[PDB]
Amino acid sequence: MQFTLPVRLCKEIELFHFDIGPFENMWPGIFVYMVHRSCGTSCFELEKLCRFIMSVKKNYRRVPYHNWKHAVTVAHCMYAILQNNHTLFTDLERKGLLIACLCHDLDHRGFSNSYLQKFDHPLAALYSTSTMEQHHFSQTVSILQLEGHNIFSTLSSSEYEQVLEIIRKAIIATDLALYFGNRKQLEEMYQTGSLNLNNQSHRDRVIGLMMTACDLCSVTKLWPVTKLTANDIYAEFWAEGDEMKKLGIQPIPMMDRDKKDEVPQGQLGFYNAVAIPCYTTLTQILPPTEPLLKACRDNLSQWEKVIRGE
Ligand SMILES: Cc1ccc2c(c1)nc(CCc1coc3ccc(Cl)cc3c1=O)n2-c1ccccc1
Ligand SMILES: [Mg+2]
Ligand SMILES: [Zn+2]
């Protein structure tokens, strides 16, 4: 609670390319700041917000990427978006989505969904698809229910089971698998013109690309930030290969450390089939979010430079 943000950062936070990298002591305080800026200071009672942000944090684990730094970075990109699109997302929405971004990878083990299903893993036995995603939501609801943690208490029960729904939904949308379709349908509603923010399930579709665009925002940071975030990402994937190898199974080339050489090519393919389309359809639906796609291009061409050896 006692925290105040080094007033020097007040403008640099509102950047789409801000990097929370150097400021780890401040990561819990930043989120609060981003909450306070959006839904006001007296949105949640200050005391039950700190319990919450702090429980949440402890339930992120020591893994290379799907960690506490990751989550807060996702909450940051959602912050930026919600602000650069101020009068177009309801009171409750801005409450739901920042919490959801902060929680959308709770208790992440560091292993893919495909891993947990290839090997009949207990969580995959619980959740038949979006194995972690539903667990991330399962963790979120669980932690709300702790004595003195239910920040959504003074919402009417009805608004309270709308928050949740946004949160469950927005967390499930982070399964890339679902991303591809969700973005295709949105590319058609735009072409067609039949996309209508009044209709609830178009918003849910837009929220989901908003969730994806946040999830991938490390691709939208400054090149020396992004280059050193990628190391975090593969570190994990290559662990997930190291376990696939230990059984005498060849991992996919994405998760194989023996092919570190091929990563520049691999990154570049990723931006062209995932990142760039995501921020393109997003910028078509939320024009102010063009800085993400602008920095996504910039970063992409950096990998092209590294492929071409410059
Ligand atoms: C040898 C090799 C072959 C394929 C490769 C690769 C290396 N690296 C990749 C990309 C790996 C990858 C996967 O998920 C992400 C999620 C979020 C963010 Cl910010 C970045 C990534 C990311 O970099 N692919 C890949 C390419 C296209 C689609 C999917 C993965
Ligand atoms: Mg996840
Ligand atoms: Zn994520």
From Swiss-Prot:
Q: How would you summarize where this protein is expressed among tissues?
A: Abundant in the putamen and caudate nucleus regions of brain and testis, moderately expressed in the thyroid gland, pituitary gland, thalamus and cerebellum.
Show where the PDEase domain sits: 1-310
Outcome when changing residue 105 to A = Loss of activity and of zinc binding
Q: Quick one: which residues bind 3',5'-cyclic GMP? A: 66, 267
Coiled-coil intervals: none
**Which family does this protein fall into?**
Belongs to the cyclic nucleotide phosphodiesterase family.
Quaternary state and partners of this protein?
Homodimer.
Briefly state the protein's biological role.
Plays a role in signal transduction by regulating the intracellular concentration of cyclic nucleotides. Can hydrolyze both cAMP and cGMP, but has higher affinity for cAMP and is more efficient with cAMP as substrate. May play a critical role in regulating cAMP and cGMP levels in the striatum, a region of the brain that contributes to the control of movement and cognition.
Protein name listed in UniProt: cAMP and cAMP-inhibited cGMP 3',5'-cyclic phosphodiesterase 10A
Q: Can you name the source organism?
A: Homo sapiens (Human)
